[PDB]
Target: hepatitis C virus NS5B rna-dependent RNA polymerase
Amino acid sequence: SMSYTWTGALITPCAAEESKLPINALSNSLLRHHNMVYATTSRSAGLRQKKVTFDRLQVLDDHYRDVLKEMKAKASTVKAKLLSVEEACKLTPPHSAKSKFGYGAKDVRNLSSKAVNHIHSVWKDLLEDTVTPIDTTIMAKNEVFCVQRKPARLIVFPDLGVRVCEKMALYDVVSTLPQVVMGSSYGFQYSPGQRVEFLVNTWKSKKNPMGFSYDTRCFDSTVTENDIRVEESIYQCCDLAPEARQAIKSLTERLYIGGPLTNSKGQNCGYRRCRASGVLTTSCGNTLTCYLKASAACRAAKLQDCTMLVNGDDLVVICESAGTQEDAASLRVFTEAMTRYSAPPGDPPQPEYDLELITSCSSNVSVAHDASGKRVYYLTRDPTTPLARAAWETARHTPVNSWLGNIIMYAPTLWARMILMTHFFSILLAQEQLEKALDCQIYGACYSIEPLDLPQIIERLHGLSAFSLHSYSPGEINRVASCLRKLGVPPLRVWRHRARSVRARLLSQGGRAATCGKYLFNWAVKTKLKLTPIPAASQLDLSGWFVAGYSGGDIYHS
Ligand SMILES: O=C(O)[C@H](Cc1ccccc1)N(Cc1cccc(C(F)(F)F)c1)C(=O)c1ccc(Cl)cc1Cl
Model:
């Protein structure tokens, strides 16, 4: 079956779109090569349509059915509850797309009678009808990148009412089931630090380690009807309320498997027969399907002691080496099996014998040293995209503040500490907006975070060592330095000069701002300070942060 069939109608914009980096008076302090940054827009949607439209074939062998039976055995130990309407409503982003039925995201969060009444009629319809295709809107994502130009990604999502219904029926399932079925291989259960720890321990557990990242080409498009019905059979293994079983069956038949695509102008754009990128189950469905195909492919390839780390379509495997030559051969067979399972590769997989050289979830393990002088492994990444998006956010307020999200996920890195923290705290000072909560995302879920809570939040997730790492690796230092040049960003020596100023300024404010100056920029002074556990860090309720992935899932954790 074709992943998509098209009518010719265009994927249309929902408002004005900007592709060129907006420039203000602050832009140059961060980046000078403005032409390197761009945002994707609907004008490239047609190009994306061509890459994502292809036929899918599947050859399912005994290794595939063996792994699935095992997955189903673990799934049968899961007991999940139906969420109430109020709970589901409270999980809805404040600015989530409004319903076509006369109410918006605020109406839902306030439990307005119109929204709640319509939500109840959608739920009832799900229970009575298990066949009628549910409508979806298809949009082109406006996302920022650096050159080396890619076309806009596509986002397909059902109406707001249906989304609240997905939450009622499946939020508990998608939040609980993956870790049970996949154990330690489920990546979304890990904070950046725990991820590193799982990777380092998994690597150290092999006599002769070897690992590779496996990039699937347009994964959502490779997901077949079979795949989606198999995912549902796994959900159905759970101990669930009868109403939840019916809604899951209905949602699978009417929405997950396929459905008509409508543009922002209300025209039919065509029909989808693959994974929708904008539904509650996108992350969980992709993770389970990637793990099932890969686990089975590991068996077919005769990979020795293969350990998976899977986050949606992002896949990394660490196993026992059989020698340089044999490895190359096994990987080839692994890739052939995945292809048979409808998970063909984009970039061909290549074995790596150096853990730090493996990139998964666009990140890699690197090493530095803490106060004591001890080696500490931490998660970093190429800062090109973080900086391109930071440049955009320097001149444009956007719904998701990636700079904040990146400071939280990459607080221990050289680049997040010296550039992002310095740059944005300088702006918050100047605009006196330090206590203004801002929306950012972690594993797809949206959170309102106050920048003044950063010190505590970081202590909680990375430990106090995040404020004292040093002696980064020549490789890391050099990648950052080279990145600054490609983008036209001031050299690290300049950010250090700046950080000294930002730090003195925060300190002058006292209170929380002073804590920020003290912990976040202790690295900027030749005579470092104390830095002891922050009493308020234990107060923060970080339960739910690193539990599951919700990318495209319309999730908000207030
Ligand atoms: O330890 C390191 O790896 C860097 C190495 C480095 C190399 C090139 C550019 C920036 C850092 N330096 C050593 C260092 C400190 C101050 C000034 C320099 C200079 F002059 F070389 F840029 C280097 C630091 O003291 C340092 C440590 C943590 C953080 Cl968050 C920031 C800094 Cl600056």
